[PDB]
Structure formats: C-alpha cells, structure tokens
Write a protein that binds this ligand. Structure first.
Ligand SMILES: Cc1ncc(-c2ccnc(Nc3ccc(S(C)(=O)=O)cc3)n2)n1C(C)C
Length: 284
C-alpha cells in the first residue's frame, strides 16, 4: 500500500537492516532513498532520530510503520565513499579532499555525540558524498537480511573484547580506520572473523596490556593466551602521511577508549589548520 506513494527507480543497497531503493515520491516528485525493513521501542527511538539534523548527517525525512514493515525515507545522495575510493584507487584521493572529508565526518560525529547518539557501525559503505564536496553519515546502527557478512574491519577493540557498554569512542576508532584507508588505498585491518580482526589490530598496534589499557585483561573475551605482538610505527602503517596526520590517527586509534581523542578535540588538531573544502570529480 505504502509503496504506491513511490516509484522504485533502482536498488542501491542491501543495508544492514534492509534493502534501500532510490525512489521518486509519486505526487511531489521528490527523489529519496527508501529503506524497507522487515519485522514499539524501535519506533520511538527511530522517531527521535528525525530530530538529529546536521549538514553531515543524511536527513531522515519520515519513519513509516505499516503492515509489519518499517520504512525509512531519507534525502538522496548519489554515491558512497566506497565507490569513490575504489574509483580513485590508481591515483589516490588527494590529501586536501581526504582532509575535508575527515573534518566533515568529525563535525558530524561531534554533533551526534553531543546529543549522546552513537553510530556504532561506521564504514565507507555508509558515508555518502555529493558533487558539492559534502560527505554525510548514514545508516546509524542500533549477517544482513541477504545473508551477506557484516564487515568487522572498522570495529573497535572494546567491542571485539566483549564490552557491554559502547562509548562514543567506538566511532572515533572506525573513522580512524577509514582515514587510514583513504590515505593508503587499502583497508587497515581487514579481518574476516572476530579473532582475525582482533589479531590484525594486535599485530599492528601491539597486543594491549594493563600498561596501555587499564582493565583490558578483565574484559569478557580477553584471554591471557593471546599472542604478544610488539607495536609497529605509524610511519610504516600510513606512509606517506605527514606528521600531523600520523599524530591525529594515532590518537584516534588509542586502545583505551578513555584516552582516545574525542571528535571535538580532533577538530582542534593541527592537522586541520589548513583544511579546505575541495570539490571531488564525480561521475554520476
Ligand atoms: C543503508 C542506507 N540507508 C540509507 C542509505 C542512503 C541514504 C541516502 N542516499 C543513499 N544513496 C546511495 C547509497 C549508495 C549508493 S552506491 C551506488 O554507491 O551503492 C548510491 C546512492 N543511501 N543507505 C545507503 C548507505 C545504502
């Protein structure tokens, strides 16, 4: 019944919760992204997200509950960062554009974190970009319905070690992983299981201990039998990124979530002293 309001133009995602269509509001001709989830607590919580409006958050226009389906109607953007990263792979995204995207995402996070909203599943597939140089956070997250594996590559270590309470720091870790990936053109920690993800982190950043992360050894999934890898330098991890970028990235990848840089503090980092807003070249 609801779909009679909307012309499905094409399928754009098999999102974490459901399928997303580009669609055209049959009466207004507004073009939107429409997410169909298959099925009260959620209705109330998701309805509150209609108020979490910011230029770097994809605008949630409406939330419809009808006939054991939840539909979410969003402002439409034309592509994700994953596709831009894959397209820019031979050449690299120019540093000023990486910088601008990071700064923008940080502004978005600072906003939602100030309102005690976490994302919990940041990844290149839910960062969306336009021709005007904007990037926006989509698909806030609290197998897929198509049985596709949900990616672990940007999961913070506290999640992987079983922490029950997430803090805003989980987002900062995800974004640091994405920043590194923009710079190097390869995923930082491409785990293909929970333990493979954790051990990739450990192999690059050192196996965490009580010195760098007090309370780590008391975590639910911590095991004394984890191998003990020494830390590597960042100069090896994200060459040829400059000192300011390296320093920022190191702070976004602190193990302790209480030491990890906040979005707000990251926006003050000297890395952004010369930030600008370049226009990407998009082929739509
Ligand atoms: C999970 C989710 N919920 C809402 C969206 C959403 C919201 C706004 N616009 C879009 N547009 C879009 C996404 C990806 C691509 S493509 C060709 O690069 O795959 C093309 C256009 N999508 N999404 C996205 C993240 C699928």
């Amino acid at each position: 019944e609801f779909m009679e309001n909307f012309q499905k133009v094409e399928k754009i995602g098999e999102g974490t919760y459901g399928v997303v269509y580009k669609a055209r509001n049959k009466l207004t001709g507004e073009v939107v992204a429409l997410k169909k989830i298959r099925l009260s607590t959620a209705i109330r919580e998701i309805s509150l997200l209609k108020e979490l409006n910011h230029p770097n958050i994809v605008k949630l226009l409406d939330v419809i509950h009808t006939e054991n389906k939840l539909y979410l109607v969003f402002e439409f953007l034309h592509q994700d960062l994953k596709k831009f990263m894959d397209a820019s792979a031979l050449t690299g995204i120019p540093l000023p554009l990486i910088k601008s995207y990071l700064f923008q995402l940080l502004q978005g996070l600072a906003f939602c974190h100030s309102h005690r909203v976490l994302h919990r599943d940041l990844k290149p597939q839910n960062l969306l970009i336009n021709t005007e140089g904007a990037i926006k956070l989509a698909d806030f997250g609290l197998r897929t319905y198509t049985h596709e594996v949900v990616t672990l590559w940007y999961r913070a270590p506290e999640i992987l070690l079983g922490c029950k309470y997430y803090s805003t720091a989980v987002d900062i870790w995800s974004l640091g992983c994405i920043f590194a990936e923009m710079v190097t053109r390869r995923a930082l920690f491409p785990g293909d299981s929970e333990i493979d993800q954790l051990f990739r982190i450990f192999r690059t950043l050192g196996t965490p201990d009580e010195v760098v992360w007090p309370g780590v050894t008391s975590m639910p999934d911590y095991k004394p039998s984890f191998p003990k890898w020494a830390r590597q330098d960042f100069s090896k991890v994200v060459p040829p990124l400059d000192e300011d970028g390296r320093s920022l990235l190191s702070q976004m990848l602190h193990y302790d979530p209480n030491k990890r840089i906040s979005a707000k503090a990251a926006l003050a980092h000297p890395f952004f002293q010369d930030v600008t807003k370049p226009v990407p070249h998009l082929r739509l």
